[PDB]
Amino acid sequence: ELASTSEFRFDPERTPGLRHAKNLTDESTRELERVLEENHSNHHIFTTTEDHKGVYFHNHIAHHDITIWALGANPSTIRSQHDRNSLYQRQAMVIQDSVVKDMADPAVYKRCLGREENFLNYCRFFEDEINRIGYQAVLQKYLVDGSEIADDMLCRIYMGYVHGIIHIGMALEFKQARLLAEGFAQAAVHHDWWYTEYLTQSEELARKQEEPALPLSDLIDLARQDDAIRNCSTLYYHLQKRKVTGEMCLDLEPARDGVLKNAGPELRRVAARYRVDPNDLERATAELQNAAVYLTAGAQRPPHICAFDFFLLHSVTSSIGHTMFLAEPSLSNAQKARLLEYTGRVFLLSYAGQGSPEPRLDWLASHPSRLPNQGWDEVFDRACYHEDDGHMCKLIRCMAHAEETSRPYDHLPEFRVKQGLFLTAGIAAIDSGTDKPMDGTKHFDFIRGSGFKEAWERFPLRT
Ligand SMILES: [Fe+3]
Known part of the structure; x- marks a missing residue:
């Protein structure tokens, strides 16, 4: 069904993807x-x-x-x-x-x-x-x-x-x-051996079914309530420098050295509750996509401008692939559920690593648009010119996909992000962009460590 292993062949009609601009050439x-x-x-x-x-x-x-x-x-x-x-x-x-x-x-x-x-x-x-x-x-x-x-x-x-x-x-x-x-x-x-240990141990524990299964949005909220999880990390992972040169390094890694060292059992207990129903995969897939936008677009802090967390946004950008896993006839329902389970457990690990920021959808919703009359097509076109390595445009395209997969479920409580807020999040994302988002491999437009108050100090106040 796919183009040849030996060459790339795209077509604006046959391979436009799940979400795209109007008139591809x-x-x-x-x-x-x-x-x-x-x-x-x-x-x-x-x-x-x-x-x-x-x-x-x-x-x-x-x-x-x-x-x-x-x-x-x-x-x-x-x-x-x-x-x-x-x-x-x-x-x-x-x-x-x-x-x-x-x-x-x-x-x-x-x-x-x-x-x-x-x-x-x-x-x-x-x-x-x-x-x-x-x-x-x-x-x-x-x-x-x-x-x-x-x-x-x-x-x-x-x-x-x-x-x-x-x-x-x-x-x-x-x-x-x-x-x-x-x-x-x-x-x-x-x-990265700690993913193998975390996902294998979490799956083993999930088999015991000790506590009821919850939607990912509820487990994001349960992580914050936990004394060990909410305190397991530090902003220091984003501030560590090499002793000799003062160069940025990640010699300590938030998941390996923080989350799994300080709150392994507590996080595994939450992870063990993300059990997906193989008979409800259209909603469970949409629910994981919505929960990624919730934890990422939600990670806002009055009185600052809206900013997106570089590590948390990998939840949004990874989440799109489950629409394809869902659409794949060759995978069993049980296989498709197990894929969602692994992904949502990693979203919890990533979230805890960044300080488990408390969602402020109220603050996100009041984002003032820099430019008038912005819809998805306007935001998409601006994302094309944004001079990073792709994260801004992937974030914006995957949030636009999530809005569409959430639309059938907008009235359900486990879907925290309601329909109007996805375009607001998209405007907030492109509006955070600058004229010089990178220098070589270094990013400047994304926050690192959104769950720590001090991360926000370099972000302007909303005017
Ligand atoms: Fe990336």
Whole structure:
């Protein structure tokens, strides 16, 4: 069903995605296919070595290029945005074809995991697997069939702030086998072991069904009520510097060193209550999308302008992929539920890491629009020109998708974000944007640590 493993092929009618601008052009589509293949062949999946900043920074070019194509970017804009973000990339790894073939021995496949030098080797392995058994059997063998290999990969798609699942979501949404292999390959080369421990232990505990299942929105609220969870982190994770040079680093990591060290049992107890009903997946999927907008767009602080949290917004951008998992006939209801469970448990981990900010939808709702007469089409067009690495446009496109998936459920209490507030959130997001949102890989327009009062000091007061 997907475009070939061996090339990117988009179409404004056949592959426009779940949410997009009105009148997508062939000219823009051809430019997008050119820049994606340049990215695949020339750039690595990580923009930094792990020791530079302490954790890997990720290559967002595939995400950014596709997103601004979907939001109606012209070919000049696609090229400009791609060229600027190319400048800080690492050089692609070498393909060794004998390793690509040897990876069919599960012992070899396992030996290569978590090693970034294998990224293109795994891309080629997953292309070969998709061609051998088809993409649907690949989702079973490498993600949901419950084998040791699929269970291992299911944790890895969340590693590195969920970029594996963002990539996989986008590969399915835009119907690209070449991008699906990239996404499995991205996940295979991560080695953030605490995701494996957290998600495996949370799933084991959930089997006991000790306390009633709750919608994600209610579990976001339960996390804040917990003394250990609400105090488990610190703004210091965003202020730590290297002793010699004073350079920013994440040598301490909020989840590994804060949340799971200080409030492991308490968070696992909350996580264990996010059990999804396999007979109610359209609503449960919409509910997870709404809960991501709730915890992210809600993370506001009077009297400051509306700002979006860089770590929390990965909840919104990852959440879209569950619309594709839902639409996939080859996945069982039980498999689709288990995917939502993992994702929502990671949203709780991420949320606790940023100080569990108390939602202020009242403050978000009163956001004054910088510009008059802004609807989604206006916001989409502005997002095309925003000069970051894609996070602003992905946030805006995935909030617009959530508004649509929430519309059937607007009257239900577990859906905290009601219909008018999604466009308000979108305006708030683009209005927070500046003329110089980045410097190389450094972001300036997003708050880090929204749940700590001191994070807000550099944000202006709403006039
Ligand atoms: Fe990201």
